[PDB]
Amino acid sequence: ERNQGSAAERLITNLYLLLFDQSGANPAKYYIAGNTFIWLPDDMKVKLDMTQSEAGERKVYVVANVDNAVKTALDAVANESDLQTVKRTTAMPWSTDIASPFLMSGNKTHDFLANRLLDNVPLVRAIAKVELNISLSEKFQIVPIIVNGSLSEFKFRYVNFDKETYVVKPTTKPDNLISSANGVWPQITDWTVWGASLNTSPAPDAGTGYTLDANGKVTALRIVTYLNERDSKGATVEVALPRGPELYRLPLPDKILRNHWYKYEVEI
């Protein structure tokens, strides 16, 4: 399905446009700064002072929600291919260190001599989203030890998530991998205990949560995280359930694609 997501997932706080000419070089650059928020969000339109005759035919790239590092890299871009070398690194590349506003990019080729308006440039988020809804079978439906809202006995880790967010994905994205925990069974000392941030009633877009029945037994678990795209296999979510604990692995897809939302109904 195509799903527009939340307002936070769609938030645009700045824009950077690059208008390449025929040879994919000499790009005209326009940074539309967040402190000026010309950008017409209510028209979903950027107006530039470059005229039709100045523009001619252009390969138009739009990047949204840059930070200063990414902006400065874009300021130095000379060729279309350079865009595929501009990337942001995140030490812990999952929620919530990856959060709104999300880096986005898109492009379209357009002849401005023919029409002053380019309609339109589709802006594609550079990250992906993973949602696990775990239904627990009877052997796991226990009264949980809860500490500050978290489930001490239920734990998870992200394995082989990529640290890089590319503005434009390289032809074959290389690897820069990390896991959120590396503790081995049975202690799994550094794994993350299950949280309750999703149990709130506006409910954020990412986090962890769970459901208790009337007997106070846990019957379902939920985890939602953002993550970076991967062209290579190995990204995994692992969960530890009370029995040492029982460990379950969910391999994510062989490719994690940008602006895809992978929802799993998991029965354990």
């Binding site: 997501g5 308006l117 602006n259 799993y264 109904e265």
Partner: peptide, 28 residues
Amino acid sequence: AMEPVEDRSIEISIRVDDFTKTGETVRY
């Protein structure tokens, strides 16, 4: 009635592309 010279300041429409959302059932 004369219209403006057809050499206008340019405009770029931008739309935020929907997620592609996929669902899968898995059991253990």
